[model samples]
Target chain A: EFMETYVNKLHEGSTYTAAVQYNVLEKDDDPASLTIWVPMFQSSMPADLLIKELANVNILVKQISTPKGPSLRVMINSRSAVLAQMPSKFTICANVSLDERSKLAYDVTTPCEIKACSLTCLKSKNMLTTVKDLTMKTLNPTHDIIALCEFENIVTSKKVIIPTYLRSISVNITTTEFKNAITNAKIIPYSGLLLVITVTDNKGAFKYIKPQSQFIVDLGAYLEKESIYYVTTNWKHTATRFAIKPM
Target chain B: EFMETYVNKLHEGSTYTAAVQYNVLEKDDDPASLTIWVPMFQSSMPADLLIKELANVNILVKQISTPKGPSLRVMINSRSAVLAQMPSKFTICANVSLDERSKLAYDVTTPCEIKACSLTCLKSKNMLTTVKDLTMKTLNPTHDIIALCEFENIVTSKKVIIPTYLRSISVNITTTEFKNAITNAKIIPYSGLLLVITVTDNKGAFKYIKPQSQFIVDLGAYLEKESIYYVTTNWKHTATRFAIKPM
Candidate 1:
């Protein structure tokens, strides 16, 4: 395979070094901890080198495969926007390259998908509920809610199971139009290069995020095409859709 | 450490399978013969069951872990987007996860230092007299470029060798204010998590590309507090700076 051909060319123990410069928001806002997740790969980076770097830095670098779900490593920072790190301004500099982890994250934040939800129903499998609506709008930062989810213009005429969490919500609708514009696109469900779900109430702090999806959807053409599903009401744009999994 | 604990919990051959999804864009477009990358993974899946499901449907599955890379194998459909010919959509959704190959690619894209020169310097370096300026304003439908470095304004003024391929253009300055904001910041170069750059152009196409960056600077009060340098440029904005190093 093509992937295999190139991958085979890399020596297992060879190490590549790169440099990434983080522009702190202020002199006082140092990151408390940083976690870097590498793809769960074997023999890509010499094991010895990975271990060496881990031992040298006070941070955590992890290797993961596929999407068993996003990895968790915390970063504590000083001052406002504690986890205020943004995408590397340059993809690579000097001898350092970002690789795929950061690049994928950035791709996630860019809105390119034309469809959100599609429907295919079988007999009711259970009496249990599922997540219906999610977003950052009602998320109370002061309330300790770590996640959010929602539904925009969902089609009706069928029963929907709503998800329940220690802290979350759901919604039902007949006809609604999601954000027709591609303003806040980001990688979700899996943590990629950026987290572009628009949040509110922050004072004068909007960096990479734009007021709308930086990209747009040519709906006129999309609708004209043989789409797999239709857009309905009760669905609006939100960031939590990509964070949770069906249990 | 938590990472050690996390790894210990996993038993060798104890299949880890998870379902995930991601949207592929025009830049990721490829012809029928080119190998397109899949987005989802199977580290968490029950290999036997996953394979069994495929076998029952007249499909064969191949999984291999070699010194080059460890991965699950399947032939994907090259229709609209390349897809794993798995039985169900759950088995068919796309995903982009982190691992070794992607990690090295990340590092390869982020170079810690750069050396660029004027036309004269390039002819002596790469042996080419016709140097061209990369002033591309749109994304190419077939290539993805990586991030190489970032320079905050506070980096100590110093002269370094210049590369012939990069001496003919003005860098993509995010804004003039951001350049001014990081006028005095500290810079530390590290290897890991560089940004990936791509663009979609006129024909609703995509291109993966590596752009060039003299430096990237983040400007903010906290940036000053953190001891990182900011970049001074002509753009008008506060908070972040972006750039890319040459390949």
Candidate 2:
């Protein structure tokens, strides 16, 4: 199996280290008392190293196969005690990544599917996308990595209203990585990139940043061939219907 | 310890189940082959029920102490095989909820901290915020849940630049829950609500959506008093500096 093969290929424990910086807002502000986060879909951080770095908290660097690949997760009984005493910034090189445990508290409801996930539904899903990773492919450089048909005439003060067709637009994010990627055969979501859009003087530029993964969607089969729509986000699966600014 | 106390209170395994809805984008879109996501910081869902409900997936409902409280996580090997055959929507009431495993594939870099996390830095942090949950407090029904100080004149294709002060603004989101919450002692982030801002004709309205946790920031302590600034998002800890539309 793919997982088994990769597991074997996994470069076992080593002195792998990464510099981590942090700022605590409050006790209730963290993902979990002992929860740890890794950037991409998966990583090669090992458990022993993570435990060493997080000994004060009982290192549980758990590695498991993810959609992207194997990743590590760490969770403990009580960690706020240790975190409270940690520095705003500290240095460590440990590895990172799950399982389930007992006692059910909340009631469960069977999952229901909808034809097309509405904005509310999409928002409720609040999922970090695994759109597409452009870096995996060989691209044609010298020109923009244009796609067939684009979004246009968009608006979203947390909502959407973009034209159905006629116009092409490019989301000029303020990410050096994005530009750098594009500069070289480079181009760019499953990226979980944060999109910061703003409307000014009725028509000003918006901004965006982050996310290691990049994706492209061909809404041709899903929507009109030439319909132009403005995109508010290009980070997830529904890039075509991400947001709107219709013509 | 808080964890020990909660574990005792954890309503041990039962027939608990929840209706979950899903729409798959691609093989690379999932959190992991077997990863599961919970909306809140923590849940009381038990593990046995989860294993039962997720038998198709090798149910791992891991419950652990999160910042807000105990939460759940699931990770497994080769789940896409099962998911590929799953319906767009299915029903399961069996209960939900981590631990670690091994392998050191990726290299770890030591973490480094910066004075004030910049847009780029903050963006890299792309964390789901654990802002102050407004629902935890009692409120004054008649007011608009207004806070001291605000942001203004913002523009971001993912960047910022607004006036230092002299402005007040309210982000009217498109959520009945947000409105209803405010309608009562009602109010609202640790609430990872998705914010969608759109600029039309130089000036117009923006939109916002979900997340259970809410937050209120008093920028007065962090910045100049009375300096008006516009907000792009109020979901995380850095809501004050989430974005800029300076006046």
Candidate 3:
């Protein structure tokens, strides 16, 4: 249960590692949502640190009926916490418990700069996957604009990658730049980490395109690393506001 | 029409360049097949050289009904002619004509050895892809083993890559090596240009498994630099035969 909380917290922040087993929750024969779970033992965390840290993140602790006995259930809803925006490392208070004697804890900020946080796209035969590069630039703070595109091959249902990352103080998309990318074959639009597009027939061809295409406008920001977020929505229907979250 | 023939010929021999456009055909509701076509004027090929050269390789050429005048149709059956086995360059007679004015052509061996031919698998977030290093080792003879795997996410209908290549001297696979790679995950099997596999759910996580896994293995030799060939099958039931084509 402790490891489950830890893994859930990591995913809630869009921080996934190899240790996390990701799965999808189905509803009415369709993959309507995603859920992540991790098998854990009491020893997975030091003492009661797991339950304590989870509570600090506002995870609800409830009672659940099980075959063995009553067990503690940690229900975590997908929400962006202040912890996500703060430049602080996640730490567990190792002494809190889940008993009548158990006490609660809180997470506070400290002087910390993200060591590394950037997104990149890796292309392979028949697949395009997005990856997070979590290397901090020097010891100083840095700003980056990254875009992650998720394309699905309509025919074979294969995944394709189309990613763009441009680091600038204020990356803006000019009218000409947009026209060039959208109308002509001259340039691909860049507005920092600003675009999330969905192409129906990409066929794993990152450098080109086909006729039928769509976009998911409200495809919200995805937090990939400390203070580094990206757009992860496949825009659908009419285009709308293009705004960037303040760093 | 000339460009189509040129491109198809190129793909058939694993000799793909960036200038070529690759696509697949559909049968029923799924992309169960592939077809390549080109539009042309008389200038695309030298007179009838295209028709004559295609016949040398047993590619059937015929006239087809189309909205625009008479179009040439080149139907290529998946046949491995002696021409496929010979270590010779795919040469197009730049100067040949059709009818009584047309002359036959031939592709023979001189000193053509592919210096490097091996398969490598690349894994990434949300995707895994295979690549072929179609490098020629020397000006002499060479043969390498390669496997190209294409997987599709049934839910999203996206194509994913799962490629493996190994370079062996005689390029033979024993019973033990097969179990190790597929069942035990101890070693990845290899042979000289000896395989093609299509996995339906290897979404870049070649290290794990999902329920309802399916495979299609006809596992043929792939000529990466010229006319490339793949079975593109999604085997429905239990895997049975482990076959390899001889060079």
Would you estimate the TM-scores of all the predictions? 0.18, 0.17, 0.17
What tens digits encode model 1's per-residue C-alpha lDDT throughout B72-99?
A: 2333322221114332321111111111
Tens digits of per-residue lDDT, candidate 2, B1-247, equal: 1110001111122322121211111132222211122222222235322323323332323222211212323233233432343232221111110111111111121111111100100110112221232222324322222211222323433322111111122433324443333223111111111121111211211112123222222121111111111121221222322222311
State the fnat of candidate 2 relative to the true structure.
Answer: 0.00
- What candidate 1 gets wrong by more than 4 Å, as runs, is A1-98, A101-191, A195-247, B1-93, B96-247
Looking at model 1, residue A190 earns an lDDT score of: 9
DockQ sort, best first: 2, 1, 3
Worst 10 residues of 1 chain B by lDDT: B114-123
User: Second chain only: TM-score per model?
Assistant: 0.18, 0.20, 0.19
Worst 10 residues of 3 chain B by lDDT: B92-101
Global lDDT of each model? Answer: 0.20, 0.21, 0.24
Interface RMSDs of all predictions?
A: 19.8, 24.0, 28.8
* Winning model by TM-score: 1
Predicted structure 1, TM vs. truth: 0.18
Name the TM-score of candidate 2. Answer: 0.17
- Model 1 alpha-carbon miss at residue A125, Å: 37
Give the Å shift of residue A157 in candidate 3: 27
- The model with the greatest lDDT is 3
